[model samples]
Target chain A: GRGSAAQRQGALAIMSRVYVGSIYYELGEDTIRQAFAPFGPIKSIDMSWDSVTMKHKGFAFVEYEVPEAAQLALEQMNSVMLGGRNIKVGRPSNIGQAQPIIDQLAEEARAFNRIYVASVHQDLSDDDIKSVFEAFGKIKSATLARDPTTGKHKGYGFIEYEKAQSSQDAVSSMNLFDLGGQYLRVGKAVTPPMPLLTPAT
Target chain B: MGRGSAAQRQGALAIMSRVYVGSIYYELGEDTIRQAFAPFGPIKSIDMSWDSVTMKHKGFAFVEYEVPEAAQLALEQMNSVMLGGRNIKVGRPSNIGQAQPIIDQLAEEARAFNRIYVASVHQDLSDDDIKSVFEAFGKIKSATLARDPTTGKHKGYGFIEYEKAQSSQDAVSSMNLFDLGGQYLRVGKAVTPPMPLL
Candidate 1:
């Protein structure tokens, strides 16, 4: 019922940090803490404001005590509507800037042989991603995700490796690794069964 | 779950479809976007994030395809495609947690308005007898009476597809709570077909 009572009973320690924008500006920390508390306990928060007239800026920076909390926030909160606003939440250091939509749709088509990444900086092309992984070991191929129609990077892609040993090494170093001024979500690729619908009634 | 029939297998996989397109030229409207996407699959709807006051294109959009596999196909071959000297982008919009449930709800809603199943069918009655009564309510598309494989008699279940929901509504409300052949009836929307053994 209360953050204090919950804390006394042993609350989770926050470790990761992310930037939150499109806030209500008035509710400030109370509203954000309430919204993200489910992901993890909060370590600290800072809401920017105008010094002269003192109008609250429409954003806040939140730091979670655990890295998993931040990862959960990234997945659960992206494009999530709160208080009528499609608020923005992702890694900090790239604060106040919008990250391209990570079109993991294509990555879902790729094999689980290596890591899948998304929400990259648009300027980072296919070769750029491959080159980065080439540092760790010999990669089979790298596909920079894109919109089929527009042909622009949807801000995601798949990286294949000949060895799982090298792939795991890549993930450890590249996961949430900052690139193109945005944090990349690196993980083991997943190809799920196709969902098929029966003939309509 | 036990062994599933063909219809039950297809029920869940039916409604998964949608994708996001980005980096569109401001000159292109929904129709132009539709043209680029139509070849891949039948489109359901297109949501272009436009500036309401200025009416300017927001350079991004969401297109709902009629088929999920079409969306996947488009994503595979279409990634990094060149259009008008600019590389456009496409993928399933993120926050996908919310997408499938919406599709599932719409699929069920669509089923209700188009078809319904009738149970407690009598051995003597035929499709025409079932149709004759329902035709009075409105236009009946099809009246299928399931048969008992062994006896070649009524299996006590049937399905009636209606041309319009108005007639379906009229017939269901009257026939649902009423008895037929001195037996209570089960009236409900036809689920993804291949009816389960009753």
Candidate 2:
């Protein structure tokens, strides 16, 4: 009955909890279990750890047996006092549906050896777009527009890779991709005009 | 202890000497103030006033601090900070002894003009609904509705006041009482005044 029931639900009813401040602890999983188990039958707990630091990222997810249990856990745990911190809890997002798009773009970005990107989206700053692609490989440098007076990003920017092959790889992989309802146009940066050349005598 | 000593103790424990700010699109609720000023220091309490005749933001709010140091920090850092797209002004509150009589006079005027002005509010009408509905007739001086503090939901009955006499009368007549998922409204003058100090 348990196996069949779990199969019916598509996935466990786990609620994703994202904590705001940095977490310094070893008992993240134990804390999540103790906080949520009182509300319902907790199926499992997943705590995301920082890859570089190998420490908890101050957030975790707890799976429940039923939707009502998940809802109860969320209602009781969201903004509730825990370990001297107010933990934020909400329904877990469908990871399968959300991860692939980000991964594909990241993979394409890493394949580039030398590339130049320009005409970045206005809503996304140069740093933000660059950071998204940085997961692929080591970025050489990225630049965004600066206001003439204040020198802040005018919201357009460019990224140049060390190798042209890497840049082409990034273009083919990430160009014309949709993200957050906007299609990103990734391509090679165009060179500025040189001095006018005289006609041949 | 003497009365002066008692007053001093009250002032020290309950730092009611913080600046007032105006709310534009949002009500300056206690939680909102706490969140805004918590980085500076702990807030003791907060209060907002609304006109009984036309239920709209009176544009002013009072916040008390628990410590004088926190109050001073808020006065310095919070002035002109953007909240809900409004650059709210913050400063040390004027001494209550100096402004108490003036506030009393304004409260009396508000009570005298209080009329049973009802708008056909829809079922589950919110505090925002009451403020927006009555503000169209005139310069809405203040607005208030009974609400639950914990949940921040409306408790149905509310009041609004307008600056001009004619605006109240005009609002009573033209306010589309029953059309927008609301009941036919009832308008009349209020009988009693609010308690002097809250």
Candidate 3:
């Protein structure tokens, strides 16, 4: 008899399971299935294999009947450390990417020099505002936004750096800081991508 | 950390959030500029170059603050004062508040004697015309006719330095910004510094 009774739930389930990356090559599919089995009876785990070397591919796919089951699997195993190792469990990348959404996410994911920050002090001067962000790296510019009508500070701003990493660091650290009545929010101020020009006739 | 660089010294000066007033009246003086900005915060100082021969300010001024925090607020507050005959621009000439803190310096004053700031004066009124109105009330001393500094022209208001406190009290009662020739005047004693200088 085929040793297929364990994790494989036929073709559809195999194609649809959540992705579990950074797998231990020494391990078996049953160990993965057992780890996630409590999440509403996982259908199976498909550990990737390198047939050329017949070696474990260091990745796996855990299957479930419904999307909810896979989702619950994600929640349960995400932080559940076991199996003499730590395994990352999460939703598959391809699930929500039907077309336009994928395009949008891809676009937003592109690297940029600026970041958008929110919830700043309206009266905060845009002039000295740069001091707060320079801690991360060399910044190109910082602007505390203002309202058009009254020309007053609008409680938010943007930061830019030559290196995106500098902007990224600011996003992480500047997100929160001690302040008067509330936290001063800081993050990347992404500039929208320039439009692609049509070829000259 | 933006210290010790030629670019940043300018940056350092800018961090204090100093403001530049442009289109200033040729006769604009530190005293008038100080008074116009007094409402926002205690002004640290004003340094400007005026053409000596003309005795007229050549049209640019820098305002420093003891506390940098209030500078931009002062900037927005003093952004414009109807002077001469039009509104002039008030803002920072430099963007020292850039990525790295333009190294900065902390960017006030007193007065005594009843120096009344005149709210309404004839546009064409000269120094003689200014005293002509107030000297009528009491002893003649010093009265000034002013053009709205930034407007680079006349804004109805002027100043009168009184010979006596009693004369100032009498001027307030009689003038009450009373009519100046045909021009209506809003006459009252100007507010003084928190701690009087002398």
Candidate 4:
């Protein structure tokens, strides 16, 4: 038999905001309200759209007045066919809230010094390169350029250090130095070209 | 809920591996795909779209799963399984989207060369053959035979272009009056000579 009051209350608390996923049409405020109205009292609905084109970003967030209502909506609407698209229903994430796990991982990765080192030895493994470069500072990630066909290392790669100073140190120390029988050309990663702003007439 | 029950259940389920199916038609029905890749990690989801006007596969699709374990299992099991009579290449999708820009650039390059020399030749030949035989030894930038021009008809020979003088020499050497299948093939460079105003 299902649990009593305490279990029911806990279950209700666990199920909160129900998320509705769409692809083609942007779900406007009215559309979202109509979809969630049947489940429970509506709290708020936020429809995301591309800022430039003003097109639906293929997903929307809906909040219900009650957790039970959200759960009901999720149970009924998950993968439900609507407007020629199967809507993906799930718990809505708190927008603008940083996920702790992701933040922790990113911080850890950042801790490992990531340098944009190019002209690297083709034979260098991720570990070998990371270990050698980590001497300068903590390396976050080391990615050797690889051929798409063979997955073999290309003669260049990027190494990210936790601190920029470490990266600079590594660059200065090892730039043009032979490592593992291949000359290494080390430098800061090149950022993509910025869009030129036209002067107003 | 039981303590750690959810995590325990998740742990029991094998990690799902994400499988990539290269290029599916924009209008490819989900039902058809479900039937196509059900063997692979329950096909958590198939994301595709008709990004082009021709309503053909837009050159990419993503299938996801809850766990990477299941995904890896599927990847190993169906790396090159035949689907719809075509060998479907499967692999883990890169964290970043790639290939689309490359394809777009290629399409642009193809359109730039508007007047393709349609080598209406003696017979069908491989793209390399057409390029090597007719286009001459110069760097053949691109080569492809006319597949269908509204009507499915092999317009005989295909076009080849040389970027340098050497290509022309190679083309002339390999082509021109080449005999194939008891028929003498004709080779001529595609020209975009200006038309005289009437």
Task: Compute fnat per model.
Answer: 0.00, 0.00, 0.00, 0.00
Residue-level lDDT of model 2, residues A122-149, one tens digit each, is 5676678778766545578776656679
Which candidate model has the greater lDDT, 1 or 3? 1
lDDT of 4 by residue, B67-185 (tens): 34335444444433445543344554533234334323333433333223433254456667666654435566667664446876544544555556445443543454457656544
What tens digits encode model 1's per-residue C-alpha lDDT throughout A95-167?
1211121122223324345566655677988898899888878888898756669998766666788776577
Tens-digit lDDT track of model 3 for B1-198: 423455544444444446666556765678877777654445667878677887777776888854333354445444434456333445554444352332322111113556665654566777787787678767756776555458766555556777776677667656753665685565555533221211
**For model 3, how does the per-residue alpha-carbon lDDT over A122-162 read when each residue is reduced to its tens digit?**
55576566776777788777775565788876555566677
What is residue B126's positional error in candidate 4, in angstroms? 60
Q: What are the per-model DockQ values? A: 0.01, 0.01, 0.01, 0.01
Where's the lowest-lDDT run of ten residues in candidate 4 chain A?
Answer: A190-199
How do these models rank on lDDT, best leading? 1, 3, 4, 2
Residues A1-201 of candidate 4 have per-residue lDDT tens digits of 233344433433333465566534744678667665654446687677787987778777777544435644654455344565556565534423323332333343344344445445556788888889888887767877676899986555667667876775675577557776755545444221111122133
- Candidate 2 residues lying further than 4 Å off, grouped into runs, are A1-8, A11-26, A95-201, B1-198
lDDT tens digits, residues B163-194, model 1? 89756655655675357677655455443333
Against the unseen true structure, what C-alpha lDDT does each candidate score? 0.60, 0.50, 0.54, 0.51
After superposition, the stretches of candidate 4 with alpha carbons farther than 4 Å from their true spots are: A1-15, A94-201, B1-198
Q: Which candidate do you rate higher for lDDT, 2 or 4?
A: 4
* Residue ranges of candidate 3 with Cα displaced over 4 Å: A1-201, B1-15, B95-198
